[PDB]
A and B are shown apart, each in its own frame.
With several copies, the nearest count.
Chain A
Amino acid sequence: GIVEQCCTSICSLYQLENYCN
């Protein structure tokens, strides 16, 4: 989920934008 992807690991702008809307 977003926490493993962006908090535990580091995510790019494009990855972060996948969780939008």
Chain B
Amino acid sequence: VNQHLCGSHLVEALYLVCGERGFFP
């Protein structure tokens, strides 16, 4: 499976992993 995280999929994964209080670039 594609393990690279680009664009919206990176944003989605940060939001999933960092949650509430999300993230910084």
A contacts, CB < 8 Å to B: 1-3, 6-13, 16-17, 19-21
Contact = CB atoms under 8 A, between A and B. Distances in A.
A3 to B, nearest CB: 7
Nearest to B20: A12
Contact of A7 (B10, B16, B23, B24): B10
Nearest to B23: A20
Interface residues of B, number: 17
Interface of B: 3-7, 10, 13-14, 16-19, 21-25
A2 to B, nearest CB: 7
A8 to B, nearest CB: 8
A19 B25 contact: yes
